[PDB]
Design a protein around this ligand. Structure first.
Ligand SMILES: CC(C)(C)NC(=O)[C@@H]1CN(Cc2cccnc2)CCN1C[C@@H](O)C[C@@H](Cc1ccccc1)C(=O)N[C@H]1c2ccccc2C[C@H]1O
Ligand SMILES: [Cl-]
Ligand SMILES: [Cl-]
Ligand code: NA
Lengths: 99, 99
């Protein structure tokens, strides 16, 4: 499909057995989600954007459904203002910018 | 052009008579550039990132050029780690998300 940007590119996603709303974010290197329960062991990580850095937990090989597609990859969990689908996942979806 | 997301979608832009590197950011509502000299009056504004809010100067009716295409709109000037081209400008360039 083709998503215009006249409004926020928000989509429904399934992760951690839960349905959530997330932002398709080309400006994000990684994918970070609000506090949620994920399986397996995690490693610490610092991610920075406007306003500085935040500490998140990194879980790997996590399954995520986005726009009727499945992606399996790294998912960060922490105090992010909004759920963010970053490039690590967007590439799995075969997403590209066009203009 | 069609831009893949394996790496950050950086592009050269023309703004304030200067040439700069900026990131095509679908998750960004606004366009924010590091300290740069812009003409006209400005208004103060607070914008929030994953790390918190930063204070910026809001300029309106600013023209930017990207890959031969031009757009006019609001440009925020402040301490941003990276220059960001947001949706308010991406729409004007006819930039879409495709997969
Ligand atoms: C207008 C402004 C630019 C202030 N907007 C944002 O920062 C929004 C904020 N919302 C949230 C919000 C905050 C307050 C109010 N409403 C909404 C979440 C989504 N971001 C957009 C991000 O894509 C911005 C980038 C900027 C950046 C890129 C590369 C290097 C440094 C900074 C961003 O924060 N990306 C980072 C990022 C993001 C997620 C996971 C990993 C990483 C690493 C890094 O790529
Ligand atoms: Cl990944
Ligand atoms: Cl605008
Ligand atoms: Na990016």
């Amino acid at each position: 499909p083709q998503i215009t940007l006249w409004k926020r590119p928000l989509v429904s996603i399934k992760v951690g057995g839960q349905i959530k709303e997330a932002l398709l974010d080309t400006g994000a290197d990684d994918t970070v989600i609000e506090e949620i329960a994920l399986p397996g062991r995690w490693k610490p990580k610092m991610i920075g954007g406007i306003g500085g850095f935040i500490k998140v937990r990194q879980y790997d090989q996590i399954i995520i459904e986005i726009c009727g597609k499945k992606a399996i990859g790294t998912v960060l969990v922490g105090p992010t203002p909004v759920n963010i689908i970053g490039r690590n996942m967007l590439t799995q979806l075969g997403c590209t910018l066009n203009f």
